[PDB]
Design a protein around this ligand. Structure first.
Ligand SMILES: [Zn+2]
Lengths: 1369, 260, 99, 67, 68
C-alpha cells in the first residue's frame, strides 16, 4: 500500500540497474559492483516491453541526473495536455471555490452574532477573496501534480501486471511511469550551458568531447528516477500554493501592514533558489541551508544596536560567501551566470521587514526539496570525528563528578525528608559530617572547598528497578537489526553476487515480542547483568539513513532485539528515577516575570529573602547545539558517571552496555541495493572495511543514552555556575540548549551600560563554559555560539524583548487533501485538517487565511476520495453505489456542517477561535448547528437532523468515551484494529506472560467489571473512565492498541495467517457502510426522539435528553450526572462599553437580586513594543495573567511516607484514595476496595488506608471538572494581549455550586477582546471596558451528591500472581 | 629493758615512716614529671586535621584518576619506545604534563605522533579566550570587498571602484575593522549603502586629504559602461574626500577622474 | 604482754616494708612508662610535617596533568568485568584490541 | 612521764601516716583526672590515622596492578 | 596503762590496714596505664606505615608521567 506523502530518504542507487536494462548510461551509484552485477528477475524484462522500447527509440544513450532537472520540471510543467485520468481534478474546481466563499459567510455571521465582528466594514470582500483564489500562480500546477500523483500511486499499487505502465504527454515534456520508476523526456534547449558547450548536469559523468558525439542530431534527452521525486514535487507545489494563497489573503484583512512577508518577494526567492539548484546540482543545498540563520540574524538586528549585535550577521555573511566561493571554483560558470547565482543570499541580506514578517519567513525552508543521500558520504561524515584521539584534563572531570554527586544529593534532600543515611566514615568527610549532624544541606555560596568530600559519600540503592507502568514501550511497531549470524541477508542477493548461507525469519518488533518465551523485567536485568550482550551473535548494530533533511547525511542505529530491550529498559529507568535532579525544560522569560521573585532567585551571595531590595535584574542568554556532543563522548570521561548510575540502583553492569559492545561491532549501512565494497562469499565472516565500513567506533550514537548525556551537560553548567559567581538557568529542547545568565544591578545605572554589562557577563560565562567543555573533550564553536540580550528562540517559541513572534506557516502550509490515515479514511483526513487549522490559529493574529485554506482543502479531499479511491477498483464511484443517484453539492454542504459528535463531518468549529478545550462537545455542536441553520432560511431541519438511530454499543465504549453519543456514524476505526490485534494475539501468544494476562475469560471479565462500574445511582461515566485504567483490563486495552498505519495491516504475515476472510474485504465493507452512513439523511433517523425533543429551546436540556435516550440499555432508569456542561458562547452577552457610557443591563435598577457580570478593563502601560505600538498584539503590559480565586482547599496527609515505591503500589494507593473519596455516605467502602486491591499488591486492606491521604473535597463534580485537570484549558491566542488586561470576576456576587468553568471565562474574555481589535490602531480604540453579563437560561445550581453501591464485583482477581504491571510480592 | 626496746621500736618505726614519706615524694615527683612531659602530645593534636584534609583530598583525586584510567595504561618509557614505531599512539590512555609536552611540540627531533599534535593543539587553542574576542570575526581585504559588493546594486558602477580604493587603503593602513564597524553602524542607522560609503570616505581620518590612486588604461574599452557618464577633467589638486574616487591615466598622457 | 607487743611491732614493720616495696615498684613502673612513651613522639611529630608537605605538593602538581585517550579502554574494561564474574574469558572471536 | 611521751609519739606517727595517705589519695585522684582528660583525643587521632592508613594502602594496592 | 596501750595498738593496726588498702588500690589504678598507652604505640607504628605508603605512591607517580 503506497503512501501519499514522503516517508523515505531519496536514494537512487537501484536506478543504475534500470538504465542498464534499457541500454542506457547513468552513474548514480559510487559502488563499482553495480556496474557489473547480475540484473534481478524483474527490471530485466524491460527488453520485452513494447511501450518502453517505443518511448526510448529516439533519445541518446547518455542520460542526465535528476538532481539538476527538478527545478526545470517545477516550472516547465503545467496542466494543458492529455492525461489518462478521466475525471480531471480541475473539473470540480468551481464547487470548491463556492464552498470556500460560503465561509466568508457564517464564520463572519458567527463572529457578528457573538459580538466580535470588526469596526471597519467593507462591501468589497467577496470579490476580493474570489479574485485572490482565482488569480493564483500555482493553481493549475497543483491540480496537474495531484493527477500525476494519483496515476503513479495506481501504477505503483500493481507493479506486477500490464496496468503498471502509464504515459503522459504535456507540451514539451513526456512522462512514462512503470512500476516504481519514472522516465522523463525533456528538450535539451532548456538546460543551462557550461562554458565548454555542454549542459551543467552532464559534466559530472561525461567529458566535454564525450558528451558531443552521443547527442549529435538529437533534441530530447531522458532522465530516470524513482516514484518518490514525483511525490516530493507534488508536496513542494502544494506548500508553495498554500503559502502564496495565505500571504495574498492576509493583505485583504490589513492593507496597511500584515504579519506575512509578501506574495511577490517569496516568488522571487523561489525563482532564485530554483535557478541556483539548476546550476549547482544537489550540492547547492549548502546555500539553501542558510535561510534560517540569516533570518535569525536579521531578527536580532530589529532592536537597539550594540557593537556585538551585528557579529551574527557578519559571521553568517562570511560563511555563506566562503561556501559559495568554494563549491564554484571547480565548476566552469560563465561570467554572466556567476552574477545571477549570487541572488539568493543577496536578496536575503537586503531584506527590510518587521520581526514578525521575518519570523514567518523563517518557516519556508523545505520548499525547494531535499538532497540525494549516499551511503558512502553519510558514513564518512560520522567516521571522521568518531575515532579521533582526544586530550583531557582530569581536574575538570573530577570537579564535574563531584558536582554530579552534589546535585543528586541535593535533589534527594529537597524531597521526601532529608539526607539518605550515609554509610561512610565520618573522618573522610571533615566538614560535611557537621551538616548531617545538624541535618541541614550546605548553601550554594560556600560549596567550593568541600566539593572533593562529596567523592567519599556512600549510600544504599536509593532508586529501584521498578516503576514501569507501560508495556507499549516494549512493542512499538519499529524495526530491529538481524543477528550477527545472518548479517548480510538484508542485502538483495543479486548485487551481492552470492546467496547468503543464513536467512533470518523476522525483522519486526511486535512479532518478536510475542514470541519471547521468557519475558519480564527481571529477565532483562539478568540478561544485562551477566554481560550477555557480548555474545558472538549479538553484535550487529546496523545503520539507517535519516528522514527528510538538508544535511549531507544523517543516520540512526539499530540493535538486535534483546539489546534494544535493554536500551528501552535503561531509558525508562533513567526517565523518572534519575534525570529529575536535572530539570531540562526550564522555559523562563525574565521580561514578563515579577521583580521580587526574580530578585530573590537571582541573589547568588545567599540572602534569598534577606538581601536589600531595589536591585533590578537584567538577563542575557546564549544558545548551544547539544547534538554534536554525541560523537565526542569517550569512556575515559563517562566511566565514573556510569558507575555511579549503576551503584544508585541495584544493578551491576547494566548502564555500561553501550561502551562495552559498540567498539566490537562492524559498522555499515543496511541498504538493499548497495552492500559494502569488496564483499564476497570467502570474506563473509571477516569482511574487509572500505569507504562505507569501519571497526573501531569509540564515540556515541544519537538517541542512545540521551538522558545521561543531558544530565552530564547540566552538571557541567552547574560547575560553571559554581566557578564564576553568576546565576545560571539551563533549558534543553531538541538539538538546542539555551543558557540564561542573570546579572543583578545595584540601580543608579540607567539603561545604556546596563545591557552592555549584562552582555559582557554572558560572554564571559560562555567563554568559561567553552573552556570547561573543551577540557572535557567536547569542542564548542566560538564562531557559531552567539550572545543575545532580549531575543531568545527555543524549540516551539521565540520572544523578542518579551514580545511573542508569530509562527503559523509551519502548520498551515502542511494541509493537503491526501494523508496516510488508515485506508484513506475520510474522517481521519478531515480531523487532521481541522487540528492543523486549530494549531495554526493558536499562533499569529489573522483568522481568515488559515480557515480559507482549510475550507479549500476539505472539499477537494472529499471529491478526490469520492472519485479516486485506491482501496477499490479503477472507475469506481463511492457516491453512486450508496445513494443510487448522482451526488450533488447540497448533500456535501449539509453533511459537512453537522459536527462529528452528532454523526457528521464538521471539524472546523468556530468556537475554537476563542479556546481549544471545550467544556462540553455536545452543547457546542448543537449551538453551532443551530446557528448555521439559522443563517440560511432553512431552519426547519434541526429536529430531523440530530435524532438519528442509536447503535448496538456494549458497555465497553461508554467507559472509553464518557462524554459521547451512541451513534454508529461518530465512531472511528480503533475498535476494528483492536479486535484484529486481539485475534492475532490469541492465535500466537507463546510469550508465556501475555497468555496469562490474555486468558480465555478476559473479554467477559472486562464486560462484567465495566458493567459493575456503571451500576451506581447516579451513574458517573468520568469516574468510571478514570478508575478503569488502573485495573488489568486497562493494561490489556493499552497493550491491544499498537496499530498505527495501513501497511502493517496488509504486509504482516502474523496478522494475515488467520485465513477465514481477508482483511481487505472487511475494510471495503466497513468503508462502504460508513460512506452510506453519511450523505444519506432522512434514512437513519427515528420519530420518537424527534417528537420527544420538541419545544425544548435550551441547549443543556437537549444535550441531557440526547445523553439519556442514548445508552438506554446501559442505564435502565438510573440518572446520569456530571457529563453535561453549558456552552459559554450561549451563556454570556457583551455590551462593549465606552469611557463615558453606562451599561443598559446594569442600569435597570437591578431590582430582584442584581445583575451578575464579569468586568474587563484595558491597561495603559506598554513596557516594550516592537516595532511600534500601533497594534495591541505588538505590545505587552504589567503582566500577571491572573493567579486564581483561591483554587481549592486541599486536605489530607499520609500517616506514613513510603520509601521508593513500586509500579503497582502507587496505582493501588490511587485506587484506594478514589474509592474512599467518591463514596462517603455508607460504610460499605471497605468491601469495595478489596476486590480491586487484591490484584495489585501483597498488602492487605487497613494497611494501605494509612498510606493514602485523607482526601475530602466538595461537590466532587467540580473536583473532576478542573481541580483534577483532565485537560488544562490554555487558549488559542498569542500571550500578548492577556498581559494588558484586568479581569474582575468578584462582581458576580453570589456567583450565579456554580455551573461555570472559571478558567475558560478569562480565556473567552481575552480572546474576544483580541479578536475585536486586531486590525485597528491602538490609539483609535473607542472602547474602554467591557461587561460580560450572564443569561438566566443556561446556568444551574448543582447539588452535592455522592455515589452509592448496592452490590460488589464478586470476581476472583487472585489469579493474577505473575510479573509485570500486575501484583508484585 | 622493756622501755628501751619500746623506744628502739618507735625510733625504727619513725625512720621507716620517714622513708615512706621520701618514697611517696619521689612517686609524686615522677607523676608530675609525666604530667609536665605529656603536654606536647596534647599540643600536637591540632596538626592532624590539616593532614587529614590534604591526604583525603589527594587520595580522592588520585583514586578517581586511576578509576578513569583503564588497566592498559603503559608507562612513560613504554610510550616513548612505542613512538619509535610510526606515529601510532600506544593503546590505552597515556599521562603527560602540559609544560613537558608543550616544550616537546616545538622540538621537532623525536618525531612526536601527528594525532597527538593536533589533539594537543585543539585542546590548547581554547586557553586564549576572554570576554572580548570570543566570537569576534576576522576581516581581510577580499572578504570586506565582497561584503561591500553584495550591498551595491548593479555592476561596473563607480561605487565598485570606490569600494576597491577604500579596501586597498585600509589594507595598506591596517584599519579595516574601524571601516567595517562604521559601515555597519551607518547601515543600521537607516542609510543607503551609497550614503554609508560616502560617510566612510568623509568620516575616517585616513581618507582626509589623500591623493586618489592612478590606474593606467589605454582607451575607453577598459572602463566599465556604467562609468562612462562620470568622466571629468582632473583638477590641479584633486581630493579623494571631495567626491573624487579615482584618476585614470591614458596612453597619450590624458588624465581623467570620476566624481559622485 | 611483751611477746605480743614484739610480734605486733614486727608485723607492722613487715607490712610497712611491703608497702615501701610496692611504692618503689610503682615508681619504677611510672619511670619506665615515662621513658618509653615519649621516645617515638619526636620522630613521628617530625614526619607529620614532611608527609603533609609531600601530600600538598602532590595535590598542587595534580592540576598540571594532561591525559591522552586510546583505543583499548573499552575492551580492557569489558574483559575485566567478564573475568570478575564466572571468570572465563569472553567467547571468541577476539575483541577489538587484545593485549 | 615515759608513758605520756610514748602515747604522744604514737599519736604523732599515726597523724603523719594519715597525712601521707591523704597526700597519696590526692595524687591518685589527680592522676585519674589527667588520664580521663587525655584518653579521648589520642583515641580519636588513632582512629583517624588508621582510617587514612587503610584507605591509602588500598589505593596504592589498586595502583600496583598497573605497572 | 594497759588499756591505753591496747587501744593505741588497735588504732595503729587499723591505720596500717587502711594504708595497705589504699596502697593496693593506688597500685591497681596505676597498673591500668598500659591500656591508655597502647594507642600511642599503635599510632607510632602506623605513622611509619603511612609514610612508607605515601613514599611508594610518590615514587610510582614518576613511573607513569614522563615529566621533564
Ligand atoms: Zn453592565
Amino acid at each position: 500500500y503506497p503512501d501519499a506523502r514522503l516517508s523515505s530518504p531519496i536514494v537512487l542507487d537501484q536506478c543504475d540497474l534500470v538504465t542498464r536494462a534499457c541500454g542506457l548510461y547513468s552513474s548514480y551509484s559510487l559502488n563499482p559492483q553495480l556496474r557489473n552485477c547480475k540484473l534481478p528477475k524483474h527490471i530485466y524484462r524491460l527488453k520485452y516491453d513494447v511501450t518502453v522500447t517505443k518511448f526510448l527509440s529516439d533519445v541518446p544513450v547518455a542520460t542526465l541526473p535528476i538532481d539538476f532537472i527538478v527545478p526545470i520540471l517545477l516550472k516547465a510543467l503545467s496542466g494543458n495536455g492529455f492525461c489518462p485520468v478521466e475525471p480531471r481534478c480541475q473539473q470540480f474546481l468551481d464547487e470548491i471555490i463556492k464552498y470556500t466563499m460560503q465561509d466568508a459567510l457564517f464564520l463572519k455571521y458567527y463572529l457578528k452574532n457573538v459580538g466580535a465582528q470588526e469596526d471597519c466594514v467593507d462591501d468589497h470582500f467577496q470579490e476580493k477573496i474570489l479574485s485572490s483564489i482565482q488569480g493564483n500562480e500555482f493553481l493549475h500546477q497543483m491540480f496537474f501534480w495531484y493527477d500525476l500523483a494519483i496515476l503513479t500511486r495506481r501504477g505503483r499499487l500493481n507493479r506486477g501486471n500490464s496496468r503498471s505502465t502509464w504515459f503522459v504527454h504535456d507540451d514539451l515534456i513526456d512522462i512514462l511511469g512503470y512500476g516504481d520508476y519514472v522516465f522523463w523526456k525533456i528538450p535539451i534547449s532548456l538546460l543551462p550551458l557550461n562554458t565548454q558547450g555542454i549542459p551543467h548536469a552532464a559534466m559530472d559523468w561525461y567529458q566535454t568531447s564525450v558528451f558531443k558525439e552521443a547527442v549529435q542530431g538529437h533534441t530530447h534527452i531522458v532522465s530516470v528516477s524513482t516514484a518518490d521525486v514525483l511525490i516530493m514535487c507534488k508536496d513542494l507545489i502544494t506548500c508553495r500554493f498554500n503559502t502564496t494563497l495565505i500571504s495574498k489573503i492576509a493583505e485583504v484583512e490589513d492593507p496597511v501592514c500584515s504579519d506575512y512577508p509578501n506574495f511577490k518577494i517569496v516568488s522571487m526567492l523561489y525563482q532564485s533558489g530554483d535557478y541556483l539548484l539548476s546550476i549547482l546540482g544537489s550540492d547547492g543545498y549548502k546555500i539553501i541551508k542558510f535561510l534560517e540563520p540569516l533570518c535569525l540574524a536579521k531578527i536580532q538586528l530589529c532592536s537597539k544596536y550594540t557593537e556585538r549585535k551585528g557579529r551574527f550577521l557578519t559571521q553568517m555573511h562570511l560563511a555563506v560567501n566562503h561556501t559559495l566561493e568554494e563549491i564554484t571554483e571547480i565548476r566552469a560558470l560563465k561570467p554572466s551566470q556567476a552574477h545571477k547565482i549570487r541572488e539568493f543570499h543577496r536578496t536575503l541580506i537586503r531584506l527590510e521587514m518587521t520581526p514578525q514578517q521575518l519570523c514567518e519567513l523563517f518557516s519556508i525552508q523545505k520548499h525547494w526539496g531535499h538532497p540525494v543521500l549516499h551511503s558512502e558520504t553519510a558514513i564518512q561524515k560520522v567516521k571522521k570525528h568518531a575515532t579521533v584521539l582526544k586530550a583531557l584534563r582530569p581536574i575538570v572531570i573530577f570537579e564535574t563528578y563531584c558536582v554530579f554527586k552534589y546535585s543528586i544529593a541535593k535533589h534527594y534532600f529537597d524531597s521526601q525528608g532529608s539526607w539518605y543515611s550515609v554509610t561512610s566514615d565520618r573522618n573522610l568527610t571533615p566538614g560535611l559530617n557537621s551538616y548531617i549532624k545538624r541535618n541541614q544541606f550546605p548553601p550554594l555560596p560556600m560549596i567550593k572547598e568541600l566539593l572533593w568530600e562529596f567523592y567519599h559519600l556512600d549510600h544504599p540503592p536509593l532508586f529501584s528497578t521498578k516503576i514501569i507502568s507501560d508495556l507499549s514501550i516494549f512493542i512499538k511497531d519499529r524495526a530491529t537489526a538481524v543477528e550477527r549470524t545472518c548479517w548480510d541477508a538484508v542485502f538483495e542477493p543479486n548485487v551481492l553476487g552470492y546467496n547468503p548461507p543464513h536467512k533470518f525469519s523476522t525483522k519486526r518488533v511486535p512479532e518478536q515480542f510475542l514470541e519471547q518465551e521468557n519475558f519480564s523485567i527481571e529477565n532483562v536485568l539478568s540478561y544485562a547483568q551477566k554481560l550477555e550482550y557480548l555474545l558472538p551473535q549479538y553484535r550487529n548494530f546496523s545503520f539507517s539513513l535519516k528522514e527528510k533533511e538538508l544535511n549531507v547525511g544523517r543516520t540512526f542505529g539499530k540493535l538486535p532485539y534483546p539489546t534494544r530491550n535493554v536500551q528501552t529498559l535503561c531509558e525508562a529507568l533513567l526517565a523518572d528515577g534519575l534525570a529529575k535532579a536535572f530539570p531540562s525544560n526550564m522555559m523562563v522569560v525574565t521580561e514578563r516575570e515579577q521583580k521580587e521573585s526574580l530578585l530573590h532567585q537571582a541573589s547568588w551571595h545567599h540572602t534569598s529573602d534577606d538581601f536589600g531590595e531595589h536591585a533590578t535584574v537584567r538577563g542575557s542568554s546564549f544558545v548551544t547545539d547539544l547534538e554534536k556532543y554525541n560523537l565526542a563522548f569517550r569512556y575515559e570521561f563517562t566511566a565514573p558517571f556510569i558507575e555511579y548510575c549503576n551503584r544508585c540502583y541495584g544493578v551491576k553492569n547494566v548502564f555500561n552496555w553501550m561502551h562495552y559492545t559498540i567498539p566490537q561491532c562492524y559498522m555499515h549501512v543496511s541498504d538493499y541495493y548497495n552492500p559494502p565494497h569488496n564483499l564476497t562469499l570467502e570474506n563473509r565472516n571477516n569482511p574487509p572495511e572500505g569507504p562505507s565500513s569501519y571497526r573501531g567506533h569509540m564515540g556515541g550514537i544519537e538517541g542512545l543514552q540521551q538522558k545521561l548525556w543531558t544530565s552530564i551537560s547540566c552538571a557541567q553548567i552547574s560547575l560553571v555556575e559554581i566557578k564564576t559567581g553568576f546565576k545560571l538557568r539551563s533549558a534543553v529542547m531538541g538539538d538546542n540548549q539555551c543558557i540564561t545568565v542573570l546579572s543583578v544591578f545595584p540601580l543608579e545605572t540607567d539603561a545604556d551600560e546596563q545591557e552592555q554589562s549584562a552582555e559582557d557577563n554572558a560572554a564571559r560565562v560562555a567563554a568559561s563554559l567553552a573552556k570547561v567543555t573543551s577540557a572535557c573533550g567536547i569542542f564548542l564553536k566560538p564562531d557559531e555560539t552567539f550572545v543575545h540580550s532580549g531575543f531568545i528562540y527555543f524549540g516551539k517559541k521565540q520572544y523578542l524583548n518579551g514580545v511573542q513572534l508569530p509562527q503559523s506557516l509551519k502548520t498551515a502550509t502542511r494541509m493537503a487533501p491526501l494523508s496516510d490515515a488508515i485506508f484513506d479514511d475520510l474522517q481521519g483526513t478531515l480531523a487532521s485538517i481541522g487540528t492543523a487549522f486549530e494549531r495554526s490559529i493558536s499562533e499569529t493574529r489573522h483568522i481568515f487565511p488559515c480557515r480559507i485554506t482549510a475550507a479549500f482543502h476539505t472539499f477537494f479531499s472529499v471529491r478526490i476520495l469520492q472519485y479516486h479511491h485506491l482501496g477499490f477498483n479503477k472507475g469506481f464511484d463511492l457516491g453512486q453505489l450508496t445513494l443510487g443517484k448522482p451526488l450533488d453539492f447540497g448533500t456535501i454542504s449539509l453533511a459537512l456542517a453537522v459536527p462529528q459528535v452528532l454523526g457528521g463531518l464538521s471539524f472546523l468549529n468556530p468556537e475554537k477561535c476563542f479556546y481549544r478545550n471545550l467544556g462540553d462537545p455536545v452543547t457546542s455542536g448543537l449551538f453551532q448547528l443551530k446557528t448555521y441553520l439559522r443563517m440560511i432560511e432553512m431552519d426547519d431541519l434541526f429536529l430531523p437532523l440530530i435524532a438519528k438511530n442509536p447503535g448496538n454499543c456494549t458497555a465497553i465504549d461508554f467507559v472509553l468515551n464518557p462524554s459521547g453519543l451512541n451513534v454508529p456514524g461518530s465512531q472511528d476505526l480503533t475498535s476494528f484494529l483492536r479486535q484484529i490485534v486481539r485475534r492475532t494475539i490469541t492465535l500466537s501468544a507463546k510469550n508465556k506472560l501475555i497468555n496469562t494476562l490474555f486468558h480465555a475469560s478476559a473479554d467477559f471479565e472486562d464486560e462484567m467489571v465495566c458493567k459493575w462500574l456503571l451500576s451506581s445511582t447516579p451513574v458517573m461515566s468520568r469516574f468510571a473512565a478514570d478508575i478503569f485504567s488502573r485495573t488489568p483490563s486497562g493494561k490489556r486495552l493499552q497493550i491491544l492498541g499498537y496499530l498505527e498505519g495501513t501497511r502493517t495491516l496488509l504486509a504482516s504475515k502474523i496478522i494475515n495467517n488467520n485465513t477465514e476472510t481477508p482483511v481487505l474485504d472487511r475494510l471495503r465493507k466497513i468503508t462502504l457502510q460508513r460512506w452510506s452512513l453519511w450523505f444519506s439523511y432522512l434514512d437513519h433517523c427515528d420519530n420518537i426522539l424527534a417528537e420527544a425533543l420538541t419545544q425544548i429551546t435550551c441547549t443543556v436540556d437537549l444535550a441531557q435528553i440526547l445523553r439519556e435516550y442514548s445508552w438506554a440499555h446501559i442505564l435502565e432508569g438510573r440518572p446520569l450526572i456530571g457529563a453535561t456542561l453549558p456552552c459559554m458562547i450561549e451563556q454570556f452577552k457583551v455590551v462593549w462599553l465606552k469611557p463615558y457610557e453606562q451599561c443598559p443591563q446594569c442600569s435597570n435598577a437591578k431590582q430582584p437580586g442584581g445583575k451578575p457580570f464579569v468586568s474587563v478593563a484595558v491597561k495603559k502601560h506598554i513596557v516594550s513594543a516592537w516595532p511600534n505600538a500601533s497594534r495591541i498584539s505588538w505590545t505587552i503590559g504589567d503582566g500577571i495573567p491572573y493567579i486564581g480565586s483561591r483554587t481549592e482547599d486541599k486536605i489530607g496527609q499520609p500517616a506514613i511516607k513510603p520509601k521508593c515505591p513500586s509500579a503497582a503500589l502507587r496505582e493501588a494507593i490511587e485506587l484506594a484514595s478514589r474509592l474512599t473519596w467518591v463514596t462517603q455516605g455508607s460504610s460499605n467502602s471497605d468491601l469495595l476496595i478489596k476486590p480491586f486491591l487484591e490484584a495489585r499488591v501483597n498488602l492487605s486492606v487497613q494497611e494501605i488506608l494509612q498510606m493514602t491521604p485523607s482526601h475530602y473535597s466538595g461537590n466532587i463534580v467540580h473536583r473532576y471538572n478542573d481541580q483534577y485537570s483532565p485537560h488544562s484549558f490554555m487558549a488559542n491566542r498569542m500571550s500578548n494581549s492577556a498581559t494588558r488586561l484586568i479581569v474582575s470576576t468578584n462582581t458576580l456576587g453570589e456567583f450565579s455550586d456554580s455551573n461555570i468553568i472559571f478558567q475558560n471565562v478569562i480565556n473567552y474574555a481575552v480572546a474576544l477582546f483580541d479578536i475585536k481589535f486586531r486590525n485597528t490602531e491602538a490609539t483609535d480604540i473607542q472602547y474602554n471596558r467591557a461587561h460580560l453579563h450572564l443569561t438566566k437560561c443556561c446556568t444551574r445550581e448543582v447539588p452535592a451528591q455522592y455515589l452509592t453501591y448496592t452490590s460488589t464485583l464478586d470476581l476472583d482477581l487472585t489469579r493474577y500472581r505473575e510479573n509485570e504491571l500486575i501484583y508484585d510480592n | 629493758h622493756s622501755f628501751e626496746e619500746v623506744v628502739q621500736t618507735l625510733a625504727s618505726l619513725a625512720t621507716v615512716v620517714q622513708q615512706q614519706t621520701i618514697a611517696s615524694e619521689s612517686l609524686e615527683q615522677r607523676i608530675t614529671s609525666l604530667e609536665n612531659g605529656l603536654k606536647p602530645v596534647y599540643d600536637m593534636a591540632k596538626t592532624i586535621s590539616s593532614l587529614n584534609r590534604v591526604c583525603a583530598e589527594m587520595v580522592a583525586k588520585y583514586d578517581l584518576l586511576v578509576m578513569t584510567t583503564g588497566r592498559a595504561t603503559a608507562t612513560a618509557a613504554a610510550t616513548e619506545a612505542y613512538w619509535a614505531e610510526h606515529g601510532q599512539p600506544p593503546p590505552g590512555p597515556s599521562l603527560y604534563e602540559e609544560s613537558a609536552i608543550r616544550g616537546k611540540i616545538e622540538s621537532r627531533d623525536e618525531t612526536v605522533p601527528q594525532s597527538v599534535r593536533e589533539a594537543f593543539n585543539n585542546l590548547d587553542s581554547t586557553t586564549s579566550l576572554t570576554e572580548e574576542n570570543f566570537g569576534k570575526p576576522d576581516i581581510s581585504a577580499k572578504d570586506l570587498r565582497n561584503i561591500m559588493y553584495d550591498h551595491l546594486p548593479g555592476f561596473g558602477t563607480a561605487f565598485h571602484q570606490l569600494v576597491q580604493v577604500i579596501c586597498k587603503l585600509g589594507k595598506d593602513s591596517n584599519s579595516l575593522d574601524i571601516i567595517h564597524a562604521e559601515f555597519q553602524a551607518s547601515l543600521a542607522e537607516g542609510d543607503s549603502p551609497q550614503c554609508a560609503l560616502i560617510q566612510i570616505t568623509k568620516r575616517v581620518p585616513i581618507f582626509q586629504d589623500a591623493a586618489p590612486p592612478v590606474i593606467h588604461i589605454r582607451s575607453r574599452g577598459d572602463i566599465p559602461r556604467a562609468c562612462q557618464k562620470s568622466l571629468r577633467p582632473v583638477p590641479p589638486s584633486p581630493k579623494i574626500d571631495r567626491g573624487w574616487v579615482c584618476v585614470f591615466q591614458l596612453q597619450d598622457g590624458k588624465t581623467l577622474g570620476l566624481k559622485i
